[PDB]
Design a protein around this ligand. Structure first.
Ligand SMILES: NC(=O)c1ccc[n+]([C@@H]2O[C@H](COP(=O)([O-])OP(=O)(O)OC[C@H]3O[C@@H](n4cnc5c(N)ncnc54)[C@H](O)[C@@H]3O)[C@@H](O)[C@H]2O)c1
Ligand SMILES: [K+]
Ligand SMILES: [Mg+2]
Ligand SMILES: [Mg+2]
Ligand SMILES: [Mg+2]
Ligand SMILES: [Mg+2]
Lengths: 70, 51, 161, 109, 39, 58
RNA sequence: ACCACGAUCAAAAGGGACAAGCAUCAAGCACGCAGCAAUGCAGCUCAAAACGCUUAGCCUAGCCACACCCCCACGGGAAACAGCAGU
């Protein structure tokens, strides 16, 4: 078997793990912003649904849950 | 005419099937009699053991 | 319901003169003084007498269904007490799958016997789902909203007309 | 000249009965793969009017074209049930059967 | 693969050809911005 | 016969058979038990197959 | 035919068939049915690829689409060679 491929996988993974440690704080903010945009997009899709259906507002009693916030 | 011929062929095959099934029934009766005798013999001895 | 513990074992139920023995022998030859497998055998014989036309034929699809149903009930009784038994959970789920497959074959081949099996064993035959896909949070929420919006539109159209 | 529906006679398996007086039936045809030159089944769904609601999921039925479609998707009617699910009568001998086995012997009659 | 698998997958789908520096064109016009030498 | 719907069924009856459905509503049953495949082909050709003369005219 | 009997040709409507890539586009969100109607049922499509994005005139005795733009053209932008020659 080629041990060099296993070594290259080891180097790439170790290099990757170093980067996530270095930029850990930056990554968390980016993920939080991405999740906020995801929730907004989901809400817009739901709103498009009831708007096309004809209703001027959401169905009575409906509240769009936050399905992406931890 | 062709449909009539096809029905006649079906009827002929049905008669042949009846003959074959009658032979099968006869053989099955003989084999079933033998197996039933064996089953009764086995049950008798097993019951006597449990007695 | 389980057979009474005073019931005789399947193997000693036809020996001539079993009713002329002492009470101690009757206890020794009953379900009271045996393991659960004899009780399951008596359950199987009871179901076979109640359902199948020829209770001596154990190779028929109905007989196999009855036997596996008794085995499934045994597994469920085990798992009520043994909640963390993963192996027996697997055995129960696999036995349920096998019984469903046999029930499908019986329904396709002999509907009258299929109905008799369903009534006698208290089995509710269900058809399998057409699609196997994850019902994640987004899809579930969207489907609930869509059903609500359809209901609201129906109310509005009834009001209009 | 007798109907505007393309498929005049078709045979299928009933896959749904949840609509009133309407059976959802799956029809399979043989289509040649141009590259492999092998025949594979191609499936199509048809709605058949069942006035008596006598169709059950899994039975093999014959559908006959309506002279004109009675609804958006209902262009056929149930001519007969070829095979009742679990209640097959052998056409060759006329006796009940369960799969490959006779429920009633042909010799009995 | 089996015949069923080959039917399911269908004919091979060769990827679109990658466009080169000229963008699939014989020649291009250009304005010289700077001249230099490379090793 | 590209426009004829052919459909197969397996182990549904004790014996094999063919059934043809005609545009007039008539049904043709051909028992094929004990018959070779060539015999079945010849029989169906004879009863429901266009003869050579019709093909030559076409 | 012209007087039509009907042929030829061919619209609208109904049924069927029909390009490529992406499943990191996997769910669509009212997409069904029955009843003369009132109304009732909750259904319909989809991993055998629905829904969606991107690409491209096509299956060439020829066919399809467009005719400056707003798909359409009451109306609006605005003043039109994708007819020939020409710039
Ligand atoms: N996707 C289905 O729900 C489904 C339903 C009926 C039959 N099948 C058959 O299963 C085979 C795999 O289909 P695919 O390539 O599109 O799936 P896939 O692997 O690409 O995944 C798509 C979805 O299908 C499910 N799936 C995957 N394998 C399946 C299987 N053997 N049976 C049922 N569901 C499965 C997955 O859960 C997933 O949600 C196919 O031959 C297909 O005919 C799939
Ligand atoms: K245009
Ligand atoms: Mg038209
Ligand atoms: Mg111009
Ligand atoms: Mg225009
Ligand atoms: Mg010009």
């Amino acid at each position: 078997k080629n041990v060099l491929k296993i070594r290259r996988r080891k180097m790439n993974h170790h290099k990757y793990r170093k980067l996530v440690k270095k930029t850990r704080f930056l990554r968390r903010k980016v993920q939080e912003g991405r999740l906020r945009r995801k929730q907004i997009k989901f809400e817009k899709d739901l709103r498009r649904i009831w708007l096309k259906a004809g209703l001027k507002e959401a169905p009575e009693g409906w509240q769009t849950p936050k399905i992406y916030l931890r | 005419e062709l449909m009539a011929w096809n029905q006649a062929e079906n009827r002929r095959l049905h008669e042949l099937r009846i003959a074959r099934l009658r032979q099968e029934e006869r053989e099955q009766e003989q084999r079933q009699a033998l197996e039933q005798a064996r089953k009764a013999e086995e049950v008798q001895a097993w019951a006597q053991r449990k007695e | 319901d389980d057979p009474p513990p005073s019931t005789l074992l399947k193997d000693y139920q036809n020996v001539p003169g079993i009713e002329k023995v002492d009470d101690v022998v009757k206890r020794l030859l009953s379900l009271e003084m045996a393991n659960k497998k004899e009780m399951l055998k008596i359950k199987q014989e009871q179901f076979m007498k109640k359902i199948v036309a020829n209770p001596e034929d154990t190779r028929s699809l109905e007989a196999r269904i009855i036997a596996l149903s008794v085995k499934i009930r045994s597994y469920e009784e085990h798992l009520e007490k043994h909640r963390k038994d993963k192996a027996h959970k697997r055995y129960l789920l696999m036995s349920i799958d096998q019984r469903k497959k046999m029930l499908k074959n019986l329904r396709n081949t002999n509907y009258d016997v299929f109905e008799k099996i369903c009534w006698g064993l208290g089995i509710e035959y269900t058809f399998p789902p057409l699609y196997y896909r994850r019902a994640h949070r987004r899809f579930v929420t969207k489907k609930a909203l869509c059903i609500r919006v359809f209901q609201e539109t129906q109310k509005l159209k009834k009001r209009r007309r | 000249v007798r109907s505007s529906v393309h498929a005049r006679w078709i045979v299928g398996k009933v896959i749904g009965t949840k609509m009133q007086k309407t059976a959802k039936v799956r029809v399979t045809r043989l289509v040649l793969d141009p590259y492999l030159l092998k025949y594979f089944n191609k499936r199509k769904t048809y709605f058949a009017h069942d006035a008596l609601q006598q169709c059950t999921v899994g039975d093999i039925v014959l559908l006959r074209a309506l002279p004109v479609p009675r609804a958006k998707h209902v262009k056929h009617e149930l001519a007969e049930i070829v095979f009742k699910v679990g209640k097959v009568i052998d056409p060759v001998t006329g006796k009940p059967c369960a799969g490959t086995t006779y429920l009633e012997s042909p010799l009995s009659s | 693969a089996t015949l069923n698998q080959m039917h399911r997958l269908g004919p091979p789908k060769r990827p679109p050809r990658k466009l080169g520096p000229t963008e699939g064109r014989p020649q291009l016009k250009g304005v010289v911005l700077c001249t230099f030498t490379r090793k | 016969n590209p426009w004829v719907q052919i459909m197969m069924f397996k182990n549904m009856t004790p014996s094999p058979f063919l059934r043809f459905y005609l545009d007039s509503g008539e049904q043709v049953l051909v028992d094929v038990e004990t018959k070779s495949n060539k015999e079945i082909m010849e029989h169906i050709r004879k009863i429901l197959g266009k003869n050579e003369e019709t093909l030559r005219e076409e």
